[PDB]
Design a protein around this ligand. Structure first.
Ligand SMILES: [Mg+2]
Ligand SMILES: [Mg+2]
Ligand SMILES: [Mg+2]
Ligand SMILES: [Mg+2]
Ligand SMILES: [Mg+2]
Ligand SMILES: [Zn+2]
Lengths: 115, 30, 86, 100, 201
RNA sequence: AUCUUAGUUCAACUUUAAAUUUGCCCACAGAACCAAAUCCCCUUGUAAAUUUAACUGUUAGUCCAAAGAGGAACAGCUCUUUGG
RNA sequence: ACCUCCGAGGCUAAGACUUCACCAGUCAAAGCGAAGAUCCAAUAACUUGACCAACGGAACAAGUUACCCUAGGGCAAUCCUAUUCUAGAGUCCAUAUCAACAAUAGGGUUUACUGGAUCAGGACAUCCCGAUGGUGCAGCCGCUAUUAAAGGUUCGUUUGUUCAACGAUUAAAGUCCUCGUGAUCUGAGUUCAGACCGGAGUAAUCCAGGUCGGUUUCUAUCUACUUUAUUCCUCCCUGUACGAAAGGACA
């Protein structure tokens, strides 16, 4: 029959060849995921429609932020083929109570202040 | 030798074996 | 249509995304005083503001969770020393 | 027919609630888990259900089991599953009734 | 080891049409047993008694017991076939019983030839008889088998294609397992239905 | 279930109004002697779920992927199941 | 599942389970005492039974409608054929012929526990005519094989699941698709009321039987359309070549 898929953990094991291929690092991982939907929930089982409805990814591309904790990754490992995950980058730090209304997210995934 | 669903066809096409090109052609070099 | 190139150069894929075209004020008065901003700009400022507030809130919660774990490890690893006396 | 578990591990089961309905003895009764004539397992004492693996020592009064254990090598043992209910509340408390 | 059209002791219970015993990689009786030439089945098919008899008659014509011999690996036909003879429409009760049949899977040896013989007599007659069998097959020797298998391993290893069926299937990459079967996870995209594509790594 | 399968009643699903607080997803643990997965919950992402009052309407659908049983492993074949 | 294999007809009380409804059904701590439905009839009663086995059950009802009427619905296991190994034969030899099994191909098998007239369009898997190869035809004709669809492809006796047989011919009396063609015409049917014979039945009536008889009407609105030489025989050439004698050619 057709059933949920339990992905073996072996795939989610970055190698020494993958690390220098994307801008990441084993130690000191990244706080937040910026996730976008690039595929339709239609034509896919209901246990993916519901997940997408839960992560706030209902609309199309429209990026949305989530924690990088396993409780959410378990959800993103089910919808990993209908989304693009990039790591949010903060090369100027979290904004203060000033500069909340003057932020901007660039296509490279960096949140910055005053454009 | 029945036909395959189309998406299985695309999967079979994209994953098709690609052989490593030899460094030199044997005809013009041992 | 060069969305691939635009994203390869840190620009928005869609020239109507974020850029000088879409967010600078489309007009001013003749004298020089600026114009009441456009609805689209207000809505984009609001949504970016909400995005930033969510970012700071989630990051704060995760850091506070790490600190709470540190505290619990202290008060369970060290309070066992109080049973190592007398 | 529905001969299967009806309260799974880590469930709060009150007195008399059926833990498991079975045909053969798949799950043997344990602490505070009683059996009926139809081999249903029910919770004698209010608490939390757990499942464990233990050693099996049948009644000598029974015959189909007392002899098979007699056919086993040195150092052998029949392990089997059990379902217990760790009770939650205490039996009772003492309260002031009269100050005389 | 001579066989008969139907088993002398047929199964009393009318077994259903079990077809999952042919659409996979042969696991039992894959390797030689003190032989030099044999037939390897590149597909998976049912052999009736007629196929077995024709195989035996064709091999017998090039036998000299003092030099070479051939022994059969396949068992006797032991699977019922339900008649439902002509004159009926669909449905209305299970039919009668026809002669029993034997299964064979891909990468299986039907009959192994042993002895110190010449390497071209096989290309003389066993090529013909392999072309005769109801499924894809070939006449193979020890050296040729080793060559083919090691080259298959090399192709699976020295593949410059970043993606293979393993990775895309196991990880459920493009929601792909919606259009595959669980057996695909273990067949590795090489046994579509009852066939066997060898050129896929 | 029905002198019943050209229909009805009950359930399941749907709708409205109202009350309340947990509902869904879910790792670790756990479910027998004789492969896909399933069940169950702490957290987590969410905002829904249960209960009550009141009605109607639909019900034994087609195709595709998959696992089975019947007709070959076919007859574009009857049926069950997971999904679309 | 009319898929796969077999049998049966002490009382009180927290909590729960269930045959996907309900109705039924099931387990049970403690406590007290002893060790297949409803309705009906007989009943003081304590309660009680058969049928309801079509086993969610009309209290009691069968066979049949060819005289019927109304409301409605309507990529073949077993196989046929050709190409592949020649392997078996053929007075020697597989290839001059069959060519067994199998394999690769294109095609169907529904019953038991629709022709004829009229006009015909089309394919070639060619019956004739045409061109060519081999031959074991030493030669016309024969045999097979390639190519060829411009043309042609008869008349009758008996009979109508539609074929088959038979007579005379012919250069030939081809295999199929479009009953091809019934608002062009006709016949048989199979299924219209009449009647008879045979089979089944208590009877009505049935019968995938055999006979005789028996009514389908149309003024053309729209499309479309209404002026695109073959064969045979006779004779010269004669009985040369071919031919082992014998027979007997092309152009
Ligand atoms: Mg839970
Ligand atoms: Mg029930
Ligand atoms: Mg008691
Ligand atoms: Mg009834
Ligand atoms: Mg009933
Ligand atoms: Zn060269």
């Amino acid at each position: 029959k057709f059933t949920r898929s339990r992905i073996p953990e072996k795939v989610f094991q970055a190698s020494p060849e993958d690390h220098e291929k994307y801008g990441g690092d084993p130690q000191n991982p990244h706080k937040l995921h910026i996730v976008t939907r690039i595929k339709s929930t239609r034509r896919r089982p209901y246990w993916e429609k519901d997940i997408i409805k839960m992560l706030g990814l209902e609309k199309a591309h429209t990026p949305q932020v989530h924690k990088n904790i396993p409780s959410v990754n378990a959800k993103l490992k089910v919808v990993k083929h209908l989304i693009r995950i990039k790591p949010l980058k903060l090369p100027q730090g979290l904004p203060a109570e000033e500069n909340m209304s003057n932020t901007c997210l660039k296509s490279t995934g960096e949140l910055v202040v005053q454009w | 030798r029945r036909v395959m669903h189309f998406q299985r066809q695309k999967l079979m096409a994209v994953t098709e074996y690609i052989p490593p090109k030899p460094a030199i052609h044997p005809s013009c070099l041992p | 249509a060069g969305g691939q190139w635009r994203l390869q150069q840190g620009l928005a894929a869609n020239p109507s995304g974020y850029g000088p075209l879409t967010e600078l004020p489309d007009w001013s008065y003749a004298d020089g005083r600026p114009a009441p901003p456009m609805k689209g700009q207000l809505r984009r400022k609001a949504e970016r503001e909400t995005f930033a507030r969510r970012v700071v809130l989630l990051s704060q919660e995760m850091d506070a969770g790490l600190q709470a774990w540190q505290l619990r490890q202290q008060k369970l690893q060290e309070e066992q020393r109080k049973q190592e006396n007398a | 027919r529905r001969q299967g578990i009806k309260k799974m591990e880590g469930h709060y089961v009150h007195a008399g609630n059926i833990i498991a309905t079975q045909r053969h003895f798949r799950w043997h009764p344990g602490a505070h888990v009683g059996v009926g004539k139809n081999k249903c397992l029910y919770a004698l004492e209010e608490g939390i259900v757990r499942y464990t693996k233990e050693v099996y020592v049948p009644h000598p009064r029974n015959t189909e089991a007392v002899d098979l254990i007699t056919r086993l090598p040195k150092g052998a043992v029949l392990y089997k599953t059990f379902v217990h209910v760790v009770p939650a509340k205490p039996e009772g408390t003492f309260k002031l009734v009269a100050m005389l | 080891r001579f066989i008969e059209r139907a088993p002398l002791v047929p199964k009393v219970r009318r077994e259903p049409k079990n077809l999952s015993d042919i659409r996979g990689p042969s696991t039992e009786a894959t390797e030689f047993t003190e032989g030099n030439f044999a037939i390897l089945a590149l597909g998976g098919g049912y052999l009736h008694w007629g196929h077995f008899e024709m195989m035996r008659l064709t091999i017998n014509r090039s036998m000299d017991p003092k030099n070479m011999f051939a022994i059969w690996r396949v068992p006797a036909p032991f699977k019922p076939i339900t008649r439902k003879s002509v004159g009926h429409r669909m449905g209305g009760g299970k039919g009668a019983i026809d002669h029993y049949v034997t299964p064979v899977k891909a990468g299986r040896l039907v009959v192994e030839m042993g002895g110190r013989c010449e390497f071209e007599e096989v290309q003389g007659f066993l090529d013909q008889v392999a072309h005769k069998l109801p499924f894809a097959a070939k006449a193979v020797s020890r050296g040729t088998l080793e060559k083919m298998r090691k080259d298959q391993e090399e192709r699976e290893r020295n593949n410059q294609n970043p993606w293979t069926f393993e990775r895309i299937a196991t990880a459920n990459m493009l929601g792909i397992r919606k259009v595959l079967s669980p057996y695909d996870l273990t067949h590795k995209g090489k046994y579509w239905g009852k066939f066997y594509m060898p050129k896929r790594v």
